[PDB]
Amino acid sequence: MNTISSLETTDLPAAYHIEQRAHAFPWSEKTFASNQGERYLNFQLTQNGKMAAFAITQVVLDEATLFNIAVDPDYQRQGLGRALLEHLIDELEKRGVATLWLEVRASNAAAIALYESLGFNEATIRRNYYPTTDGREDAIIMALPISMAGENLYFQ
C-alpha cells in the first residue's frame, strides 16, 4: 500500500534519512530546512507505513522547479518515483502552473529517459556544472509544459 501526502516539517528527518541512503552527494540537514515554507509544494510517498520517496518543489508565480527527488534504495524499480512525479504534475496542473523545471546529472541516462516519457524536453545544458568522484559532469536542464493559456482570441 502506497500513500502520497504533503511533506511537513516533522517529516524532514525521514526525508533526510532517505537522502543519505539514496544520494552520493547528499543534501545537508540545513539545506533541507532551507527548502520549505509557503513557496514550496513538497510531497512524500509512504509504503506500508514507512516513507519511501520524497519530492521538493518550489513554486514561484506560475513556474515550478524541482529542487530534489529521491527514492529509498529498498524501494527502487517499484514505480514510486513516477507515482510521485505524476502526483506533483497533476497538482501543479490543477493550480494552473505553466511549467515544471528540473536539473539532472548527464550520466543519469535512466532518469533522463523516464523524464522524457513524462513529456520533459531538454531546455539547455550546463557544462561541467556538477562535481563527480572523478572530476566534473554536465547538468541537463529539462522543462515540462503543464497548463494551457485560456485567454485565446479577443473580441469586442
Catalytic one among 91, 93, 103, 137?
A: 103
Cell numbers for 87, please give them.
502526483
125 carries a ligand binding annotation = no
- Count of CB atoms situated within 10 Å of the CB of 88: 22
111 carries a ligand binding annotation = no
Helices (H), the chain: 12-22, 29-34, 80-94, 109-117
Strand residues in the chain grouped as ranges (E) = 2-6, 43-47, 50-60, 63-71, 99-105, 121-131, 136-145
Does residue 103 carry a catalytic annotation? yes
70 carries a ligand binding annotation = yes
71 carries a ligand binding annotation = yes
Q: Annotated binding site for acetyl-CoA, which residues?
A: 69-71, 108
Looking at the annotation, which residues are catalytic? 103, 115
